[PDB]
Design a protein around this nucleic acid. Structure first.
Ligand SMILES: [Mg+2]
Ligand SMILES: [Mg+2]
Ligand SMILES: [Mg+2]
Ligand SMILES: [Mg+2]
Ligand SMILES: [Mg+2]
Ligand SMILES: [Mg+2]
Ligand SMILES: [Mg+2]
Ligand SMILES: [Mg+2]
Ligand SMILES: [Mg+2]
Ligand SMILES: [Mg+2]
Ligand SMILES: [Mg+2]
Ligand SMILES: [Mg+2]
Ligand SMILES: [Mg+2]
Ligand SMILES: [Mg+2]
Ligand SMILES: [Mg+2]
Ligand SMILES: [Mg+2]
Ligand SMILES: [Mg+2]
Ligand SMILES: [Mg+2]
Ligand SMILES: [Mg+2]
Ligand SMILES: [Mg+2]
Ligand SMILES: [Mg+2]
Ligand SMILES: [Mg+2]
Ligand SMILES: [Mg+2]
Ligand SMILES: [Mg+2]
Ligand SMILES: [Mg+2]
Ligand SMILES: [Mg+2]
Ligand SMILES: [Mg+2]
Ligand SMILES: [Mg+2]
Ligand SMILES: [Mg+2]
Ligand SMILES: [Mg+2]
Ligand SMILES: [Mg+2]
Ligand SMILES: [Mg+2]
Ligand SMILES: [Mg+2]
Ligand SMILES: [Mg+2]
Ligand SMILES: [Mg+2]
Ligand SMILES: [Mg+2]
Ligand SMILES: [Mg+2]
Ligand SMILES: [Mg+2]
Ligand SMILES: [Mg+2]
Ligand SMILES: [Mg+2]
Ligand SMILES: [Mg+2]
Ligand SMILES: [Zn+2]
Lengths: 156, 96, 66
RNA sequence: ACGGACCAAGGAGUCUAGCAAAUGUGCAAGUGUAUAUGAUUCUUUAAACAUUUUAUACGCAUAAUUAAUGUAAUAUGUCCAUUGUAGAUUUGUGGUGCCCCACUUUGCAUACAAUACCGGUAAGCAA
RNA sequence: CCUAUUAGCUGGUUAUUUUCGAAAGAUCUCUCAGGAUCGCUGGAGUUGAUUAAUAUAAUUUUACCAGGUAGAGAUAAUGAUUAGAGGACAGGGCCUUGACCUAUUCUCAAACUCCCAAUAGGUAAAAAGGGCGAAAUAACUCAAUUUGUAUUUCACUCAUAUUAAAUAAAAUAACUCCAAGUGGGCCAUUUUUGGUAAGCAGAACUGGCGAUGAGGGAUGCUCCUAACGCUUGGAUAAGGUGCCUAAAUAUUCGCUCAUGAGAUCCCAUAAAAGGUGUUGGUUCAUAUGAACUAGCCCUGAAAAUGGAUGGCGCUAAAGCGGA
RNA sequence: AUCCGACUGUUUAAUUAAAACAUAGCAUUGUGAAAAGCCACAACUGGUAUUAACACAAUGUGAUUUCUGCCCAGUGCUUUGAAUGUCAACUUGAUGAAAUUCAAUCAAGCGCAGGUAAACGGCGGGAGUAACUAUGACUCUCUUAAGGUAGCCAAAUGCCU
RNA sequence: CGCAGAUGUCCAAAGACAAGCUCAAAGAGAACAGAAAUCUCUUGUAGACUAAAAGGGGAAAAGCUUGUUUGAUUUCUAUUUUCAGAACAAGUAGAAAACGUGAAAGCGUGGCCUAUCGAUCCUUUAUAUUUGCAAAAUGACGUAAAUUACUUACUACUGUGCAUAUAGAGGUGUCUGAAAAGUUACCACAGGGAUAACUGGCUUGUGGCUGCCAAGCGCUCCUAGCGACGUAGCUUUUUGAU
RNA sequence: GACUCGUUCAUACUACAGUGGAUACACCAGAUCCCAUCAGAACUCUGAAGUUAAGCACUGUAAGGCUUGGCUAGUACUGAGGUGGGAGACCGCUCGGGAACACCAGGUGAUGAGUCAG
RNA sequence: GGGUAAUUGGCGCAGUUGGUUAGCGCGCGGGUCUCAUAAUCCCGAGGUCGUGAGUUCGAUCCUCACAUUACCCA
């Protein structure tokens, strides 16, 4: 018959890496979390309490609940013509602060002073990012002794 | 499965504390002839129509669950608890 | 006679006919079963704030209409 | 693969009960003159017209909840009409063309939340 | 007579034009020729947008994340597997063959792994919001009537007209209600399981046939171009220009002679092994002798009514490879 | 000359005339009567019966000749009963305010103990051994309720054939 | 009706907590003692063990040995897996109460994680200062007064039997859950080329026919005639497969 | 010159060697008491005679391992197109992406908070 | 599910009977008339299906083989 268990098909997903076994470090227990934060769900198999389900390994969400040792996360999931919000309750070892946001934060902080300076001198500032574009012309100096001629090779 | 005859646990009736209980086993009990369902069935079975209700025959299980009966020793109120199904059950025996 | 037993041929054409719909993006959600001893305190805070606001508004009304 | 030699006439989603949604009409915290009775109604009329000379026939609605004895919607400080975010319309200034912006005023329908109260259950007390 | 008994099963089911337009998956079922439920479709109605904006997107970019398939390895673990070499408990009385150890050596894995792509995925890219201060409310938290944390109130301020990265017949949007028909499918490229194989049976992504006609493939449900109101004129695609048949017996280079030549997707069969046929090329030996290589042609090549590059026919091609 | 049926007789109107049915002969079973055997009927009443064991009723086999072996464990049928387990209503007793509840007892059946196969039916394997080989009178061993006897045969009954 | 396998169980500890410890194996050495009894020492990333299939996890531990225990306890929410985003079932994060362990921070709502199971109706026992049995009463005339009686006021606690609310159990393995033996060679009806028994079609394993190489046969001599070990085809006069 | 609590979790590990002791870290001297065993070995308690032999710290091996570059190599593999080649098995072209083992060379750490001596 | 019987040396069984208890045959060896010495006497290993108030029970609350007949709404 068919075999659809809770941990079926996770032979390689839920296994430790080479020469990297053992339980987590002590600083993992000092991480700070707040409501509305972005977070990554990465299962750690050496802690068997409160593991996430197979599908959610590697997804990102927002925090909607904090407890003694647990965090609730809001995660999207595709079901056949729509996307549903899922409420996932996991323990604190399977939780990592998300890094997907940092460029926006640095951009805001850095653009603040540029705006403040430009308005202080009453200049015109453009702060939106620029897509890579076509390249301008230039004059390239090259001695004739440095150009090497090539040609196709014979077969061997 | 070996379960001792006494046990100190929480009492949910009349004294909300851990007290000393006695443990025994629950048994069904005999159907009484004056209950409403049995009166209805006995009236339906009279007359000229043969059997009137289903009779089960396709038996599959070989065990039963082992619900225990607990009884507080300060107050004399009782309570039930269910265990997983087993084949051999003993109430106070020689330890391993 | 046998028959087919599975295919999901043509299923995502049907899925894209009315597109992939999305969640709704509301501003508040219900705190029914969430962290207690924290939202009861919040109820007290908001009752105190509302009391102060209503008392000031009512007093202003009382003196304005005289 | 089955029906069809030809022509004319006939030939198949309807009626009644009961419920709902949609839409048109009348009145509106009410609405519907039941069975009957009345009349200077009586070819048509088996239709139409009327209602018993501080006004208790009945149905549905106006209040829920519980097996049930039953109990029953802020509360008298003010005839006032619970709270917040977005939001139609209105009020006062300025900008570009009665319209759109900015500030200001009011805050429908509705969406998302909070709070108070009524019936059942659990908990803590309990004549 | 009850009686026009009952049928998840065969057969039939009557005027026109216009507009929109499917499913042959899935869950449960004394269920497998049925049904209910979701999905796909139509019709009503409101809320919005109409401001080259915002909501939005089967698409990219910038930042970040997760992976163990293709490949590789066997001197890295597990499991297989050929052979010698060098060293310090069995053996016929100082040597067989061994055993043990050390460094090598030939070859492997859907249910092996030190490593690890391409493609395919997910989150983010600012106004109901962000930043920085002060004050007020708590029965929560803390050693703390200041420790913190929500929430609330006031101040100041964060690019826009080029719109906090590009592009967009982006609002043809969002949401309620009432319902039909479907729930036997098949085919093609690429990936892929069973089988000697099959116009066999079973899966994945996409495009189609079905439900669809037009030009081409002689002919043909699924191949190529291309999808459809009634016309006039112009210029093409796919494919063709000796006659059948509209348009080159066009131009410019090579190759080929067949007493069963050859003639282009799907497509309508041919191999090992041979040739002192002819045409190019490579490597050896003083103007000969060899050994290889690959284009056309030939041998290998046997079935039943009389027959098929579509037919006639074609050799200074009307054949094959180019311009 | 072989097979089948003893013979005369009968049969599927309209695809089968036979080896099929009947038959004389043989065997078994029930019953001494209006309170009996077998059978009909809603009830009252009837058939055999104007009968009486050399009779009526129910079966099997199928002339004559010569024969009819072993098994009562299984399933049927049948015989004895207060020594005897189980087995209804009614009835009797105890308790209780009463409805109830609890006890006890010689019905038939089954069980216990016997009979019966011209009732339904059943009736085995392995190994060694005699002066050339071959065979096995003989022996050992497992085992059944009983182990296919007199006969007969590649038969309308034998696959291999 | 692909491949290699497993399930209808088992455990008062094989559950909870804490502490100490380190395992398989090899080498050297010690009376009887030897290939293997019990003793020291060196090395030892798990090569052991962890109830039962296979996969994942585990070293001052999740393994071994001890000590104390019954968190395998009562009540409620937000939710994940299958999915219609229904039930059951099996899980994750928490709240109120009473406890175990440890010096303490803490941990504990069964078994280190992934399987080990069940509706309506009926029956059966537990719980309650909650109810009923259609004109009424049943503890009790209880406690205070007063009579010349149908007197007055106060009270949480009131007959047998039955019914009912809430919680567990008695089972449906065809496991979203009917009380169910055969035969038709005497046969009937509605249908099916959705499906068997012929010809035809694709395939060619099997059947049949033809090839290539050269070990060897042929006294001698590969090839007059043959041709083992291996290899490429053809046909539809066999039988299969669909 | 040394110590306590940490962070990276092998450039930090492993095998052999060399060097060091103002204070500190150790080995070390004992068992009355708290405590612990077959065993004061370990664990617990009370001390200050001796020593850098060992732990520990720094350095050295054409050391093993680990780590960073170069090469292997535009090789193996692969997304999109093709009325492309070839009986097939398989293999080029156009628009794009791009490994692994091995081999060669360098390296063997860095750091937060708080104290002691001088 | 209900009623009845039954479990006692190795084998077949007696007993078993409240301050009373456990035996016989058979099976296994010893001394024995020692011409089958048949027959045999004295000896030993030998046991209550298991629980418990109440003392001394085989009385009695329960489950565990087996046998007989009858019974059945999840
Ligand atoms: Mg037909
Ligand atoms: Mg016809
Ligand atoms: Mg007509
Ligand atoms: Mg209406
Ligand atoms: Mg009230
Ligand atoms: Mg009082
Ligand atoms: Mg009819
Ligand atoms: Mg259309
Ligand atoms: Mg049909
Ligand atoms: Mg993955
Ligand atoms: Mg591979
Ligand atoms: Mg390889
Ligand atoms: Mg088309
Ligand atoms: Mg063609
Ligand atoms: Mg034209
Ligand atoms: Mg022409
Ligand atoms: Mg020569
Ligand atoms: Mg042609
Ligand atoms: Mg032509
Ligand atoms: Mg005759
Ligand atoms: Mg005759
Ligand atoms: Mg006839
Ligand atoms: Mg005839
Ligand atoms: Mg006859
Ligand atoms: Mg006769
Ligand atoms: Mg005869
Ligand atoms: Mg008999
Ligand atoms: Mg009797
Ligand atoms: Mg027979
Ligand atoms: Mg014989
Ligand atoms: Mg003969
Ligand atoms: Mg491991
Ligand atoms: Mg431990
Ligand atoms: Mg454990
Ligand atoms: Mg079923
Ligand atoms: Mg089912
Ligand atoms: Mg029948
Ligand atoms: Mg067919
Ligand atoms: Mg063949
Ligand atoms: Mg030294
Ligand atoms: Mg090195
Ligand atoms: Zn109690």
């Amino acid at each position: 018959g068919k075999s659809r268990g809770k941990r079926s098909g996770t032979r390689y997903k839920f296994s430790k890496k080479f020469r990297k076994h053992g339980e987590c470090t002590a600083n993992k227990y000092l991480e700070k979390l707040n409501y509305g934060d972005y977070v990554d769900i990465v299962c750690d198999s050496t802690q068997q309490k409160g593991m996430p389900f197979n599908y959610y390994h590697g997804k990102t969400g927002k925090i909607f609940h904090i407890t003694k040792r647990g965090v609730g996360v809001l995660v999207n999931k595709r079901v056949k013509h729509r996307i549903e919000q899922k409420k996932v309750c996991v323990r604190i070892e399977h939780v990592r602060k998300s890094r997907c946001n940092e460029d926006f934060l640095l951009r805001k902080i850095k653009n603040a002073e540029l705006i403040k300076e430009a308005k202080l001198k009453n200049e015109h500032i453009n702060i939106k990012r620029k897509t890579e574009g076509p390249k301008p012309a230039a004059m390239i100096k090259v001695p004739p002794s440095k150009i090497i001629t090539i040609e196709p090779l014979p077969f061997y | 499965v070996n379960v001792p005859k006494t046990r100190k646990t929480y009492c949910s009736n009349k004294c909300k504390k851990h007290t000393m209980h006695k443990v025994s086993q629950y048994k069904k009990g005999k159907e009484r002839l004056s209950s409403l369902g049995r009166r209805r069935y006995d009236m339906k079975q009279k007359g000229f129509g043969g059997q009137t209700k289903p009779v089960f025959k396709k038996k599959a299980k070989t065990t039963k669950k082992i619900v225990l009966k607990l009884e507080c020793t300060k107050c004399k109120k009782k309570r039930f608890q269910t265990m997983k199904r087993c084949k051999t059950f003993e109430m106070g025996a020689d330890k391993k | 006679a046998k028959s087919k037993n599975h295919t999901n041929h043509n299923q995502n054409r049907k899925a894209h006919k009315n597109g992939i719909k999305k969640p709704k993006k509301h501003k508040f959600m219900s705190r029914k079963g969430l962290d207690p001893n924290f939202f009861r305190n919040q109820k007290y805070c908001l009752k105190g704030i509302q009391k102060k606001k209503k008392e000031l508004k009512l007093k202003a009304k009382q003196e304005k209409n005289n």
